[PDB]
Amino acid sequence: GPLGSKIASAREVIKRDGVIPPEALTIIEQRLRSDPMFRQQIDNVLADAECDANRAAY
Amino acid sequence: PLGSKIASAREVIKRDGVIPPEALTIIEQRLRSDPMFRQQIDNVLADAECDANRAAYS
């Protein structure tokens, strides 16, 4: 339906431009609250970044 | 510094399940650099699209 079509187009922005538009962000945030595995996944992505950054000089 | 900014954003995600702008930056860089994470994000959206297109009356 029309809402599914809008989600499909948001998927294309991610696929073609590597940008997460607002509607996609909110879906991803809902997923953080409804999927313990994905919640862990996202924490892992950020943890990878943090651990490297914490021990950096600059 | 980048480390403690990331750490604070991880806590926001854990507590509230919303993604601060500074964490979104990191997430976008990850999906631009990591084919599997890019597809994992698409899978989240694909499920939302599929659900939005559920059988329904009009």
Cβ atoms of A10 and B45 within 8 Å: the answer is yes
What length does chain B have? 58
- Minimal CA separation from B38 to chain A, in Å: 8
**Which member of B3, B10, B53 has the closest CB to residue A4?**
B53
Identify the sign of the CA torsion A48, B10, B22, A3.
positive
Q: Which two tokens stand for residue B36?
A: 């599997």
Amino acid code (one letter) for B12: V
How many Å apart are CA A19 and CA B33, to the nearest integer? Answer: 13
| Structure method | X-ray
Q: Which residues of B touch A47 (CB under 8 A)?
A: 10
Domain that holds residue A50: 1-58
Give the 3-state secondary structure percentages of chain A, helix then strand then coil, rounded to 5.
80, 0, 20
Give this entry's resolution in angstroms.
1.0
The DSSP letter of residue A34 is: S
Q: Which residues of A touch B14 (CB under 8 A)?
A: 39, 43
How many Å apart are CA A13 and CA A15, to the nearest integer? Answer: 6
Nearest Cα neighbor of A40 from A32, A51, A48, A52 is A32
Helix ranges (H only) for chain B are 2-16, 21-33, 35-52
What is the total count of domains within chain A? 1
Which residues, including other chains, have CB under 8 Å from residue A41's CB and lie 6 or more apart? B40
